[PDB]
Amino acid sequence: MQSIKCVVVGDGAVGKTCLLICYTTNAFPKEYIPTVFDNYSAQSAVDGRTVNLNLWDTAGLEEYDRLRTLSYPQTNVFVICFSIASPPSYENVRHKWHPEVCHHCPDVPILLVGTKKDLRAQPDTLRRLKEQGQAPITPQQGQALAKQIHAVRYLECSALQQDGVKEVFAEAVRAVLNPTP
């Protein structure tokens, strides 16, 4: 067998719990589960190779940052899922999340994810961020964040629609499986 130490980080309540519980248990958290952090294991096939995944719903909280930084050592990949609905999460990724993780552990593969992808053309989140004076993360903006953090790829997921989930985590597997230049 093979399970990859994959810690998933991102701002508080931005879908880390949601996307991970969509991937591991295949149910969308309807309410915000307050992550402290949860260590899962799942099984999936990536491009013809079955693999186990030792995963982490890790805290968006700065408070359990330390506890999440406790998951920082030994970690083989950093799946950072930022809210498309909260480009402030984009900012904290390009200011804290990716910085903090590359400071405790540089050169580790990092997979950038746009959570709540279903909301980009959806009227609700558009108008919300507009009355919030912000724009839901356009795919090229997430590409810019990925190249910024030198991410393996920017992948968009909708935990509400189970969208992008399995592909995102197959990518998280393959990034350690086959490193990219």
């Binding site: 053309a121 009227p123 558009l126 108008r127 507009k130 009355e131």
Partner: protein, 300 residues
């Protein structure tokens, strides 16, 4: 249904490389929502900023172009802004869900009973003296003796503009002017609508190379109720070409005029009325009185 419309005035197109004569009116679409509930007053709150999804005429030629290979045989023509606003009206009659993708607006609604006074008396907090007022283009079931108004809603409806020599159907801007019995244009005479002052002469929308465009464009008219008895309107139909010097130097290829009084004295009977667009001598068509002597419209 409450229906709003947007015309992008300014330049003929949002394309870089050439200037366009600033203030070029280009249609930008419509938003509609039923108000059968809103009229009945069920949604009763000042604070409800109803976001309304706005749909433009479908300019759907951005992502579909890139991926069509191994069997290319297609030539399609431009009706994506040549699309009729009558047709867009029919669509939004049918259309229930608007994938505006953020292009929309916000409105806070109520219904206040009583007349303009009570509107500006019982709820002047909503409606001060400076608050904008719109009136149904119609008449009331109750008539006060002395219902002093002089509104004349004049609606550009549609018109055939044959290409002629120009393969591009002439990019018709209609520009009509309110004159005395001496061709003398009057200022402010044409009122674009509510909450805004009238204008001396009015300019239509430039339909992008349309041979039989349809306007639905209505303007308020109000004149001295006795001087209107001796006034007329005259009309310039000009090909707003994309070249600024050419655009301004382009003249009204089309000429028209109309009188406000039937020579008997009656005001023109309401309803639809047709027009011949005029070419040729414009000194014949720019004379304070001679074109008055000339015939102006189809039926006459």
């Amino acid at each position: 249904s409450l229906v709003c419309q947007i015309v992008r005035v300014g330049h003929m197109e949002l394309k870089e490389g050439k200037k366009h004569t600033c203030g070029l009116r280009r249609p930008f679409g419509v938003a509609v929502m039923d108000i059968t509930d809103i009229i009945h007053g069920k949604v009763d709150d000042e604070e409800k900023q109803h976001f309304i999804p706005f749909q433009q005429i479908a300019m759907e030629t951005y992502i579909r172009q890139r991926q069509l290979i191994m069997s290319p045989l297609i030539t399609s023509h431009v009706i994506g802004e040549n699309e009729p606003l009558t047709s867009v009206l029919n669509k939004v009659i049918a259309a229930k869900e608007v994938n505006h993708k953020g292009q929309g607006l916000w409105v806070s609604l109520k219904l206040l009973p009583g007349d303009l006074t009570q509107v500006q008396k019982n709820f002047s907090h909503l409606v001060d003296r400076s608050t904008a007022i719109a009136r149904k283009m119609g008449f009331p079931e109750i008539i006060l003796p002395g219902d002093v108004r002089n509104d004349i809603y004049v609606t550009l409806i549609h018109g055939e503009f044959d290409k002629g020599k120009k393969k591009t159907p002439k990019n018709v801007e209609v520009t009509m002017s309110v004159h005395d019995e001496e061709g003398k244009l009057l200022e402010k005479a044409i009122h674009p609508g509510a909450g805004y002052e009238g204008i001396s002469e009015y300019k239509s929308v430039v339909y992008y190379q349309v041979k039989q465009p349809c306007w639905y464009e209505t303007v308020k008219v109000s004149i001295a109720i006795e001087e209107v008895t001796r006034c007329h309107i005259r009309f310039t139909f000009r090909h707003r070409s994309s070249q600024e010097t050419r655009d301004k130097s382009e003249r009204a290829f089309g000429v028209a005029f109309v009188k406000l009084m039937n020579p008997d004295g009656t005001t023109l009977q309401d309803g639809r009325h047709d027009l011949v667009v005029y070419k040729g001598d414009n000194k014949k068509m720019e004379d304070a009185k001679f074109y008055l002597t000339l015939p102006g419209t189809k039926m006459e």
